[PDB]
Amino acid sequence: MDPTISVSKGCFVYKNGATRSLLGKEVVQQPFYEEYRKAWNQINDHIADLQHRSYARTLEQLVDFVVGQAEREVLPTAALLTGINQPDHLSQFTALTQRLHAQRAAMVCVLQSRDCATLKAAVETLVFGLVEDNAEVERLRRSQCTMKQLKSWYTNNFDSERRQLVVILPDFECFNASVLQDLILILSAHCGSLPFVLVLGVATAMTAVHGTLPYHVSSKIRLRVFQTQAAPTGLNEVLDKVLLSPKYAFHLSGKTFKFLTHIFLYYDFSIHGFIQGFKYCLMEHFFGGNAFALCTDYSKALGRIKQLTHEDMETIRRLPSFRPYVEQIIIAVLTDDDYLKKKLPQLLRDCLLHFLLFRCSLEFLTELVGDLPRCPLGKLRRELYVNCLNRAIISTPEYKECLQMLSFLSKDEFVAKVNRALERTEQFLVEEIAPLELGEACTAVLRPKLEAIRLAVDEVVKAGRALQKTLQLIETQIVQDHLRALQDAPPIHELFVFSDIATVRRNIIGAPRAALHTALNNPHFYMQCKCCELQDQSLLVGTLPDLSVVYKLHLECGRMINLFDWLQAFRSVVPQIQARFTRAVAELQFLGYIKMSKRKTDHATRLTW
């Protein structure tokens, strides 16, 4: 058959120059790869900086706890109440280790639950981690690493100067219970000899630590509880300050934004999974060609226009927002390639200014509706962002219900809310819009509209119809023009937003059973034959493949399956037929749909119900 279907081995090495940046140069020098690398590195550095600014307070508390233990038997321990998303947490501990290597306050060993199956392996991993941590800051065997060697090493090194011995346990729930209890007893027995600090990584609650630590074990424990900020709070902070930040030209659409937030809030609280899904979305957007490399600031996009080729204009011609720009004006647009080359920077500055005014109008309207009760549009910026990019926001009945509830209030609360909206929008314009390039025209366009709103507030505070005038003016100069949908968007807005959701939905969320169910119900969806078509999903025509017929034939039967009537009904549908049926029951057992029971002479049981 094949070279790799050997009956003896299972693994095959194709070493070509291995000893003790995957793509070529022709793809890297393309401008979309450089633009995607710059944008992804910017977004990843911003998310890392936000996570550092979130974690730094609890990091300082833990460092002060270790130092205050050093300035000082039971051992001092510190349960760190992290979230359920474990792969987000260990990097946090690494940051703590770096700070504990800054002040020379301790040296840190990390005990994973995979290394601590027994007490011997846990003690050996602990001593080896501490000794190699000292060796790496400034080799013993596996069976040589003992607590007596740790005591001798600590006497030889750090008795003359004290360094704490911080023991970090990142996955407290996944430990063997008896190994963890005996490790706490071992560490508490050596108090006074070796200064031990025990940092825990409890993910669920303090009830877990109180349950898995018995009476005699918790008699030697002086724990102090720390709290980390929650994963929905970190998600909302990342969404407020990065994904809605105006200084990135790459926008998401409403459906992809809702898809990624649904993946976070409904399935798994993993910030890293959100980051990798957003990275895949940014990669799938920018990997459409050099035409999508114009999605940056103004000067770099103008340069990329000046270096652009012919096929990039040919693929910005095909995008659906380009054609109503043509129909609204013709003989030079569609083929001549230079009329569009001189017409593009106006469209680029139009889309950039439209998205900047969209963010500012979104800030204004979320301050206006955010303190309102009953929240018909949502509380934060993100739900209003989805509802304002999805559809016509004024044609939606939720905005009319919002207007009915804003009319049901007094004049004092309305005046206070619109003054708060004016002050917040001016603060957002002076802080975050002002350093941004092509931001001067943004303020110079949106600010006289705000002067109109503020003068309407001035006439309603000087004198019920002026409240309605303020509401309709807020509608007319903020909600109508600067808060469009994605269908009422400007021309050629595809380069900047990303609406391709079915391909990303297939390639991020994995549905093996849907594809198996479709390929076993109608193979015509995959084979695309002119003969295997089915009107309904149970016709069972004769030109079907073999495994589809056997799956349909066992699907209608009961729990227990006989070989005889199933083989006879297969002969009724479709020698070598026995070899084909043996091949079919082997392939259908291989997928996990049925199972041949052990010494049930021919009867096989279906595991799917």
Binding site: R317, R318, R323, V326, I330, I331, L334, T335
Partner: peptide, 17 residues
Amino acid sequence: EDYEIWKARMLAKAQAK
């Protein structure tokens, strides 16, 4: 519709102006 037939019809009607 196809971009080819739409571009062809728009160019032909642009010659029909």
